[PDB]
Design a protein around this ligand. Structure first.
Ligand SMILES: [Zn+2]
Ligand SMILES: [Zn+2]
Ligand SMILES: [Zn+2]
Ligand SMILES: [Zn+2]
Lengths: 167, 162
């Protein structure tokens, strides 16, 4: 049971029957495998950059230029808005159980959240915009990638474990 | 920039594309275990097989290399005409998919044989993934599209950004 992340540019649902895509109009669209539109997720007030399905398949996360991450159910309903980043959010990922969300922001931080929208941790250390984030299968360990040309590995108590590329 | 890190199935090994033409294997505590040496240019993408025993690496040298977990080079997959950015294993581990600057995705077996070339993206393909059942392949491109393909290399659908 792996995490799910926006970093590969594809967000299949766990059964592969639904696919989520960031649209060019501040929306996320859900499609079936035949290219038919199922849901438009409306609510972001600026560009949507990253999307992920929870491994539960019931929740979708979207990262936006409007500095928020939004959580949606599969039937298109907005569930939560995760606020706290001070700049664009580029990337979003779910832990393998779907109960933790990680967000990667232009504000140089990764933030970790629960599904009720509560901020759990801020990972600070990157000297530049953080564009990518992903969980380990153990669900304890997090990788982030930044324009500072480094990749950092963290615990979910927010301690830096290693800088894997770069310095 | 593309994503350069992959987890083993249990999370106890982490592969990362290094800035020195190598892949490095780390344990979960950040300790270096192995360096995979052999690519002749930058390494951009890595993946683990579902059994955790094979690692794939995608390189600016236009190849994908397959390695065992103890650091030994198993195969070099040759055929892309430009940088390879991304690499993925199918859920059964028997197929490898590669995403290239040459605007194609290629599908390979573990013995290094080219099975299919997926053409249709109008620009560099940076990301590729299999569906969970392994019957559909998804690719993401600088042409701002995501395309869904079957295993025979037929384009099924394009998500366009509308
Ligand atoms: Zn260096
Ligand atoms: Zn790009
Ligand atoms: Zn449109
Ligand atoms: Zn449009």
């Amino acid at each position: 049971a792996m995490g799910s992340s926006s970093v590969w540019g594809v967000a299949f649902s766990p059964d592969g029957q639904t696919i989520a895509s960031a649209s060019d109009d501040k929306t996320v669209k859900l499609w079936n495998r035949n290219g038919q539109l199922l849901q438009t997720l409306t609510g972001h007030s600026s560009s949507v950059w990253g999307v992920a399905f929870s491994p539960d398949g019931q929740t979708i996360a979207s990262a936006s230029d409007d500095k928020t991450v939004k959580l949606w159910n599969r039937n298109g309903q907005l569930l939560q808005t995760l606020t706290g980043h001070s700049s664009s959010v580029w990337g979003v990922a779910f832990s393998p159980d779907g109960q933790t969300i990680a967000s990667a922001s232009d504000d140089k931080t990764v933030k970790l959240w629960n599904r009720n929208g509560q901020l759990l941790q801020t990972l600070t250390g990157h000297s530049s915009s953080v564009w990518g984030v992903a969980f380990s299968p153990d669900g304890q360990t997090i990788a982030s990638a930044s324009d500072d040309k480094t990749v950092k590995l963290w615990n979910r108590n927010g301690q830096l474990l290693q800088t894997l590329t770069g310095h």
